[PDB]
Amino acid sequence: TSQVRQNYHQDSEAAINRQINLELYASYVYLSMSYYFDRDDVALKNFAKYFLHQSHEEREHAEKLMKLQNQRGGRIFLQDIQKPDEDDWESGLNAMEAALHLEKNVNQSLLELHKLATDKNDPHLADFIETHYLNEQVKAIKELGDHVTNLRKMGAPESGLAEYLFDKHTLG
Amino acid sequence: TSQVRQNYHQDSEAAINRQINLELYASYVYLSMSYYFDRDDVALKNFAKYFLHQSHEEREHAEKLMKLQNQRGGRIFLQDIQKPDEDDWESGLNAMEAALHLEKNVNQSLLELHKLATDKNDPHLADFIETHYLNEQVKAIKELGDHVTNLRKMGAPESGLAEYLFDKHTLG
Amino acid sequence: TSQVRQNYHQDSEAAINRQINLELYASYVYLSMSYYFDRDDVALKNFAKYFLHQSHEEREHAEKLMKLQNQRGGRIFLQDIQKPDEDDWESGLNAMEAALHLEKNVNQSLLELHKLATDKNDPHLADFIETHYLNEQVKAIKELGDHVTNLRKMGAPESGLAEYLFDKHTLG
Amino acid sequence: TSQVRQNYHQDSEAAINRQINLELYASYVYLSMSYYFDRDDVALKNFAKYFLHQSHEEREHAEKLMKLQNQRGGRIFLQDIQKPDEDDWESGLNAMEAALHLEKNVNQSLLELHKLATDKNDPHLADFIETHYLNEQVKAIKELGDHVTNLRKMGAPESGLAEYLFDKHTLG
Amino acid sequence: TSQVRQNYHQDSEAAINRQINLELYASYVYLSMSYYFDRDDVALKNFAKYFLHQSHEEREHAEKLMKLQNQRGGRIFLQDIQKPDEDDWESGLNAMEAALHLEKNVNQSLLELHKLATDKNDPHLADFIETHYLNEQVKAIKELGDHVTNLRKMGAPESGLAEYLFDKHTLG
Amino acid sequence: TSQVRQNYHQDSEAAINRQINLELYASYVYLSMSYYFDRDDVALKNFAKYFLHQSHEEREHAEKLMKLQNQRGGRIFLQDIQKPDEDDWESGLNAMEAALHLEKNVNQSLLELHKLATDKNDPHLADFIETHYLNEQVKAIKELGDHVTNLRKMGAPESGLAEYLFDKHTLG
Ligand SMILES: [Ca+2]
Ligand SMILES: [Ca+2]
Ligand SMILES: [Ca+2]
Ligand SMILES: [Ca+2]
Ligand SMILES: [Ca+2]
Ligand SMILES: [Ca+2]
Ligand SMILES: [Ca+2]
Ligand SMILES: [Ca+2]
Ligand SMILES: [Ca+2]
Ligand SMILES: [Ca+2]
Ligand SMILES: [Ca+2]
Ligand SMILES: [Ca+2]
Ligand SMILES: [Ca+2]
Ligand SMILES: [Ca+2]
Ligand SMILES: [Ca+2]
Ligand SMILES: [Ca+2]
Ligand SMILES: [Ca+2]
Ligand SMILES: [Ca+2]
Ligand SMILES: [Ca+2]
Ligand SMILES: [Ca+2]
Ligand SMILES: [Ca+2]
Ligand SMILES: [Ca+2]
Ligand SMILES: [Ca+2]
Ligand SMILES: [Ca+2]
Ligand SMILES: [Ca+2]
Ligand SMILES: [Ca+2]
Ligand SMILES: [Ca+2]
Ligand SMILES: [Ca+2]
Ligand SMILES: [Ca+2]
Ligand SMILES: [Ca+2]
Ligand SMILES: [Ca+2]
Ligand SMILES: [Ca+2]
Ligand SMILES: [Ca+2]
Ligand SMILES: [Ca+2]
Ligand SMILES: [Ca+2]
Ligand SMILES: [Ca+2]
Ligand SMILES: [Ca+2]
Ligand SMILES: [Ca+2]
Ligand SMILES: [Ca+2]
Ligand SMILES: [Ca+2]
Ligand SMILES: [Ca+2]
Ligand SMILES: [Ca+2]
Ligand SMILES: [Ca+2]
Ligand SMILES: [Ca+2]
Ligand SMILES: [Ca+2]
Ligand SMILES: [Ca+2]
Ligand SMILES: [Ca+2]
Ligand SMILES: [Ca+2]
Ligand SMILES: [Ca+2]
Ligand SMILES: [Ca+2]
Ligand SMILES: [Fe+3]
Ligand SMILES: [Fe+3]
Ligand SMILES: [Fe+3]
Ligand SMILES: [Fe+3]
Ligand SMILES: [Fe+3]
Ligand SMILES: [Fe+3]
Ligand SMILES: [Fe+3]
Ligand SMILES: [Fe+3]
Ligand SMILES: [Fe+3]
Ligand SMILES: [Fe+3]
Ligand SMILES: [Fe+3]
Ligand SMILES: [Fe+3]
C-alpha cells in the first residue's frame, strides 16, 4: 500500500480511473465537434473555437483527477479513449444538443462518484468532487441549455442565417 | 421538465422558493431598521448605514438563490414580502438583538434546506448552501452577538452616550 | 410632533408612505422579470440585466422617499410588498409592455402626489417630486415605449430571432 | 448558553478542543525538528527552515480552530502541549518519516471530527473541516511522501551527500 | 467533392487521418508518463512537467493536422485513442527510452506520409510535412537521445541520485 | 562534546532549556488571553489582537533561545508546555494584571540566568541576555503597568464602557 494512502477505498480508486476516462472522452467529443465547424462546408469559426476551448478544459479536468488519484495514493490505470458517436455533427444546434447530453452524462457519473465517496465515508473525495466538479457541471449544462434555446428560437438548424448570427453574437 | 434539470427534487425546488422569500424578508427588515436610525429623534447615522448595507447584502443573497433555481431548472415562484414585525425599533441595542434573532431564524431555515438536500442526495445543492450561505450566517451571527455584548457592557439602551459612542467607534 | 416638522400635512405623510410601497413593488416586479429572462428556456441575458438594473434603481427611488419622510419629520410605515401579477412574463415584448404599464401607473401616483402637495401648499414636497421623480418617469416611459415599438416592428414575439437581436443590439 | 450557539453539539465542541491541542502539538513537533537541523553536528539549514515554516503553519491551523470555537459559541479549554516523542531526530529522512506519520495522525483525527459533525447534522462544521483542513492534509501527506521517496532513492540517511543535496535542491 | 479540394488524393486524406490518430496516441503516452512521475513513490516533478509539456505539444500537432485535412477538403475520421503499452514506466531512463522509441515511430510514419505525398505529386502536402513536422521530429529525437545518454552516463536507473539530479539540473 | 562548545557551563545549558520552556509558556498564556477576548460575550477585538501579537513575539523569543543553545553547542531538551492557570480571564483589566505578573516572573528568571552566566564567567551569555531580553522585559512591564493604570483610572472592570474605550483608543 502506498505510504500516503489513508481512508481511500478500492472502489473509489476504481471510480476515479473511470472518471478520468470519461473526462478524456468528453475532451475528444469536443475536439471532433470543433473541427466539424472548421469544415469548408460548415464554416462557423466561433462554434469551432467554442468547442476547442471546451475540449482543452475537459483535458484539464482529466489531469486534475489524475493528480487526485496520486494525491490519495491510488494508481492510475488508463483505458482507450473511444472515438465519438458521430463523425458529422449536422448543425450548430445539433452539436449543442449533443454537448448538453454529454454534459448531463458526465454529471450523472460525478453524482454517482460523490454518492460512493459518501457511502465510503471519504469526505475529502466528496468535497473534491463538490468543489471542483459539481458546480462546474451545473454551469456547463445551464450554458448549453441556454445556447440550445436561443438557436431553437432563432430558427436553427433550417435557418443558416440563425446559426451564422449566433456564431457572431453569442460565441464571438 | 426543463432540459437542464438533473437530480433536483420537487421538494428542494420548493424549499429554494421559500428561502428566496426569507432572504427578501430579511432585506426588508434591515431596510426598516436602517431608516429608523435615520429619524431625527434617533439620529445614529452609522447604525443607519450598517443596516442599509445589510439590507443590500440580503438582496444579493436572494438574487443568488434565484440564479440557483434557474441553474438547476427549477421555476421561481415569488411570494409577498411581509412587512417587518416592528415599525419602531426602540434603540440600537434592541435593533441589534432583533437582527441577531432574524439571522438565527435564517440560519435555521438554511440548515433545514441543507438537511433536505442531503436527504435527497443532492450534493450540488448541499455544497451550494455550505459554500455560499452557512459560513456567512455563522459570521453574521457572531458579529451581531459581539455588537449586542458591547452595547450591553457599555450601558445601552439607557445610556444614549453608549449608543452614540458605539455608532462612532464600532460602526463608523 | 417631530421637532423638524414644518408645513408637512398628515395626508402628504400618508401619501409618501404609499409611494414608498409602490416603488418597492416596482422593484419587485422588475426583479421577477429579470430572472424570467435568466431561465434556460428563455435565455435572454441582456433582458435579464436590463430588468435587474431597473429593479435596483427602483429600490434607490424607494430609499430616497424614506429619506424624504424622515427629512420632513414624518414617520415611515412600511407595508407588505405584493408579489407581481405574473410568474411567467411570456416574451421580451410582453415584459416590456408590462413594464410600460407599470411605469405609467407609478407616474399616475406621483402626479397625484404632486397635486396633493400643491393643494396643501407644500412647495418643498412638490419640487422634490418634480426634481427627482417626474422627469425620471417621463424618460422611463419614453424608453419603454421605444423598446416596445422596436420589438413590434422587428416581429416579436413570434420572431425569436427579433428578440435575440434586440437583446444583443439594444440591450447589450 | 451562548447567544450565538446554534446546531452545535457538546461533543463537537469537545472534539474541537481536542483538535486545537493536536494542532498545537504538531506545531511543537515541527519546532523540535527544525532546531535539530540547526545543530552544528547536523547543519542542514533548509531542513531547519522547512520544519520551522511547518511549525508556524500548524500554529495558524490551531488559531483558526480557536476562532471557530468562538464563532460557534463553544468555549475554548486548552490543555498542556506535550513535548515530542524524540529529542534527536537522527537524520533528514527519519524526520521526514516522523512528519509523515504525524500528518497521517492529524488527518485521522480530522476525519473522525468530520464524521462526528456529519453524525450530529452539523453541515457548517463539516464543511469548515473539508474546506480548511482536509485538502491541506492530503497535500501535506503527499509532499512528505514525495520527500521520503526522494531521500530513500538518493541513499539517505547513510549518504550524507544525499541529505546535503536534497537540502539544497528540494528544500532550498 | 468539397469545393476546395484540389490535387488531394484519397490515399493522402486517409494517411492524414491515420497521422492524426498517431499524434493523439503520442499525446496520451506522454500524459501517462507524466503522471507516473507524479506518483508519491516516484516523485520526480520535472520529469512529470517535461512529459506533460510533450503531451500538450502532441495535441497541438494533432490539431494542426485536423486543420490541414479541412484546408485541403478532406474529411476527418477519428478513431479510438489506444491506451499506452505500459501503466508503470519503471524509471526516468526507461521512460526516456520509451519516448525515443515513440518519436522514431512517429517519424517513420511522417516519412511514409511525405513519400506518399511525393508519389501523388502533392507538393503542398509534402512541404506541410517538411516544414511543420520533419525537423520538429529530428529535434525531438536528438533531445531524447541526449537525455538517455546523460541518464545512462550518470548511473540511472540504479542510481536514484542520478535521476534526482537530472530532474533538477536538466529538466528543471 | 560539541566541536563549537567553549566556555559554556552545563548549568547555563540547563538554564537556557528552562528559559525556552518559560518563553513558550508565556506564548501560550497570551494565546489563551487573546481568544478569551474573541468570545462573543467578551468581544474586545483589540485586546484580542494585542495578546495575539504578544503570543507571537514570545514564540520568537523562545526560538532565539533555541538558536542560542545551538550556537553555543548546547543541546535543546524541550518539555511540556503547561496550560495556563485560567481558562476565563474575567476582564481586560484582570488579563492585563495577569500579563504584568507573568512578565515579572519571566524577568525574574532572566535575571537569575544573567547572574548564573556572570557567576560562570560567561560574558557572551550575559550580554546575549542583556542585549536581547532584559530591556525588552523592562519595556514590556512598563507598558503593562501603564495599561493597568489607565484601565483602573477609567473605571474598569465594572465599567464596560471603560474597557470598550481603552480597546478603541489605546489598543486600536
Ligand atoms: Ca486506505
Ligand atoms: Ca478498500
Ligand atoms: Ca482501479
Ligand atoms: Ca471505440
Ligand atoms: Ca459509431
Ligand atoms: Ca452511428
Ligand atoms: Ca447514425
Ligand atoms: Ca455559480
Ligand atoms: Ca430531476
Ligand atoms: Ca422530484
Ligand atoms: Ca415550488
Ligand atoms: Ca403582512
Ligand atoms: Ca405586526
Ligand atoms: Ca406588534
Ligand atoms: Ca408590540
Ligand atoms: Ca462541500
Ligand atoms: Ca471565517
Ligand atoms: Ca407640520
Ligand atoms: Ca396636518
Ligand atoms: Ca402615514
Ligand atoms: Ca399579495
Ligand atoms: Ca395573481
Ligand atoms: Ca393571474
Ligand atoms: Ca392569467
Ligand atoms: Ca430629459
Ligand atoms: Ca446548540
Ligand atoms: Ca448538545
Ligand atoms: Ca469541551
Ligand atoms: Ca508530556
Ligand atoms: Ca518520551
Ligand atoms: Ca523515547
Ligand atoms: Ca527510544
Ligand atoms: Ca490540490
Ligand atoms: Ca482532388
Ligand atoms: Ca483520389
Ligand atoms: Ca479517409
Ligand atoms: Ca486499446
Ligand atoms: Ca498492453
Ligand atoms: Ca504489457
Ligand atoms: Ca510486460
Ligand atoms: Ca519545401
Ligand atoms: Ca534545428
Ligand atoms: Ca565548555
Ligand atoms: Ca560544565
Ligand atoms: Ca540541559
Ligand atoms: Ca499542566
Ligand atoms: Ca489550574
Ligand atoms: Ca484554578
Ligand atoms: Ca480559581
Ligand atoms: Ca528603551
Ligand atoms: Fe465542459
Ligand atoms: Fe468535464
Ligand atoms: Fe446579513
Ligand atoms: Fe441572508
Ligand atoms: Fe424605472
Ligand atoms: Fe420608480
Ligand atoms: Fe503541515
Ligand atoms: Fe495542521
Ligand atoms: Fe514531441
Ligand atoms: Fe508529434
Ligand atoms: Fe511580551
Ligand atoms: Fe518573552
Swiss-Prot record, chains A, B, C, D, E, F:
Family per record? Belongs to the ferritin family.
Binding-site residues for Fe cation 2, renumbered to this chain: E58, E103, Q137
Enzyme class, broadest EC rank: oxidoreductase
What is the protein's name according to its record? Ferritin heavy chain
- Give every Ferritin-like diiron domain span: 6-155
Work out whether the entry's keyword set contains Iron: yes
Gene Ontology cellular-component terms listed? autolysosome; autophagosome; cytoplasm; cytosol; extracellular exosome; extracellular region; ferritin complex; ficolin-1-rich granule lumen
Marked site: Essential for association with cargo receptor NCOA4: R18
Q: Name one GO biological process term.
A: negative regulation of cell population proliferation
- Tissue distribution: Expressed in the liver.
Q: What reaction does this catalyse?
A: 4 Fe(2+) + O2 + 4 H(+) = 4 Fe(3+) + 2 H2O
Instruction: Outline what the protein does.
Output: Stores iron in a soluble, non-toxic, readily available form. Important for iron homeostasis. Has ferroxidase activity. Iron is taken up in the ferrous form and deposited as ferric hydroxides after oxidation. Also plays a role in delivery of iron to cells. Mediates iron uptake in capsule cells of the developing kidney. Delivery to lysosomes is mediated by the cargo receptor NCOA4 for autophagic degradation and release of iron.
Record's subunit section: Oligomer of 24 subunits. There are two types of subunits: L (light) chain and H (heavy) chain. The major chain can be light or heavy, depending on the species and tissue type. In the human liver, the heavy chain is predominant. The functional molecule forms a roughly spherical shell with a diameter of 12 nm and contains a central cavity into which the insoluble mineral iron core is deposited. Interacts with NCOA4; NCOA4 promotes targeting of the iron-binding ferritin complex to autolysosomes following starvation or iron depletion.
